[PDB]
Design an enzyme around this catalytic site. Structure first.
Site, PDB file in Angstrom:
ATOM      1  CE1 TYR A 231      -4.377   1.394   0.861  1.00 53.05           C
ATOM      2  CE2 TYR A 231      -2.960   3.107   1.758  1.00 53.05           C
ATOM      3  CZ  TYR A 231      -4.200   2.685   1.320  1.00 53.05           C
ATOM      4  OH  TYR A 231      -5.269   3.550   1.348  1.00 53.05           O
TER       5      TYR A 231
ATOM      6  CE1 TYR B 288      -6.169   2.187  -6.880  1.00 54.82           C
ATOM      7  CE2 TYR B 288      -7.102  -0.003  -6.549  1.00 54.82           C
ATOM      8  CZ  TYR B 288      -6.060   0.811  -6.960  1.00 54.82           C
ATOM      9  OH  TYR B 288      -4.919   0.233  -7.462  1.00 54.82           O
TER      10      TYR B 288
ATOM     11  CD  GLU C 197      -3.831  -2.747  -7.463  1.00 60.91           C
ATOM     12  OE1 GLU C 197      -3.500  -3.943  -7.335  1.00 60.91           O
ATOM     13  OE2 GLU C 197      -4.792  -2.243  -6.843  1.00 60.91           O
TER      14      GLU C 197
ATOM     15  NE  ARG D 118      -1.420  -4.620  -3.625  1.00 56.83           N
ATOM     16  CZ  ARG D 118      -1.851  -3.361  -3.571  1.00 56.83           C
ATOM     17  NH1 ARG D 118      -2.403  -2.801  -4.641  1.00 56.83           N
ATOM     18  NH2 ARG D 118      -1.743  -2.668  -2.443  1.00 56.83           N
TER      19      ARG D 118
END
Ligand SMILES: Nc1nc(=O)c2ncc(C(=O)NCC(=O)NCC(=O)O)nc2[nH]1
EC number: 3.2.2.22
Length: 263
Positions: A76, A119, A173, A176
């Site tokens: 994060y 988000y 992202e 990930r």
């Protein structure tokens, strides 16, 4: 003391971007925890503060630089530094609030946004959803400038939030999901920005549930299938970790791994 990974949008290529994302994954995971060939991020519980964050230093063609702080427990983006000011999203809890005091300690201006960094909240502030926000090297070059000029009033709140949404997807992202890294490679290769399609969005939204389903699986088999979307928006059912091996690169830690027997 926290590790720093550098990336610049100036002259970026598929290879320089891939090197970057690979290095980010390398600092996020320790190799102590891999399940079904998929690495798991460090357990937040008992994690020493000195191992809690990593720093991503972004520079652009405009010769500006900003430094993002990522939490290794979930990848994060928790805040950033630009020159003499640091900004942190509204922490989820007291322990996170204390943790972020260990970041950018000598910065002379420290601010904590009154809003969180998820988000949903960022999209509200931006006045746009992810599906309507173009990604790629251009957007990232622009996001870096936008974050850099925030303290001086040059960047409006909506543009700041939009810029966060761009950085998070192209860095967190991408780290990930190999799939999402691949999507950003394509945009970088042809220097053609574009908004994320449903295959990207649904993966982003499902990361937590996919992590849990895999770690709770029976030998890789999901108790309950998870529905994702393909590019054209059609349904794609996930029944098993096997189909995700090429797709997901890192999982958030949910359970300890049960004992593993050899029949
Ligand atoms: N700041 C920030 N950094 C990230 O890496 C990030 N990554 C993901 C999301 C996000 O809303 N994901 C969907 C969601 O609903 N998250 C909460 C949850 O389901 O646990 N937000 C982020 N915000």
């Amino acid at each position: 003391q926290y590790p720093i990974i550098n990336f610049t949008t100036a002259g970026a290529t598929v290879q320089s971007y891939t090197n970057f994302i690979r290095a980010v994954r390398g600092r996020l995971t320790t190799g102590a925890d891999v399940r079904h060939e998929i690495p798991v991020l460090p357990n937040r519980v008992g994690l020493p503060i000195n191992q809690r964050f990593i720093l991503v230093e972004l520079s652009n063609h405009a010769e500006l630089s900003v430094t993002l702080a990522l939490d290794v427990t979930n990848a994060y983006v928790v805040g950033y530094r630009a020159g003499n000011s640091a900004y942190f999203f509204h922490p989820d809890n007291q322990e996170d609030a204390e943790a972020i005091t260990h970041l950018f300690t000598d910065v002379q201006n420290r601010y904590t946004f009154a809003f969180g960094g998820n988000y949903d909240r960022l999209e509200q502030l931006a006045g746009n959803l992810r599906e309507n926000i173009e990604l790629g090297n251009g957007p990232l070059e622009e996001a870096i400038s936008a974050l850099y000029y925030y303290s001086t009033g040059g960047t409006q709140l909506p543009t700041l939030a939009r810029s966060f949404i761009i950085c998070i997807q192209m860095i967190s992202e991408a780290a990930r999901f190999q799939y999402i890294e691949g999507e950003m490679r394509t945009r970088i290769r042809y220097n053609r920005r574009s908004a994320p399609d449903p295959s990207v969005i649904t993966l982003e939204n499902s990361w937590g549930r996919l992590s849990t389903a895999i770690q709770e699986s029976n030998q890789g088999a999901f108790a309950s299938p998870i529905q994702l979307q393909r590019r054209n928006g059609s349904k794609f059912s996930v029944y098993d970790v096997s189909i995700l091996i090429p797709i997901i690169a890192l999982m958030v830690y949910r359970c300890a791994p049960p004992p593993s027997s050899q029949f």
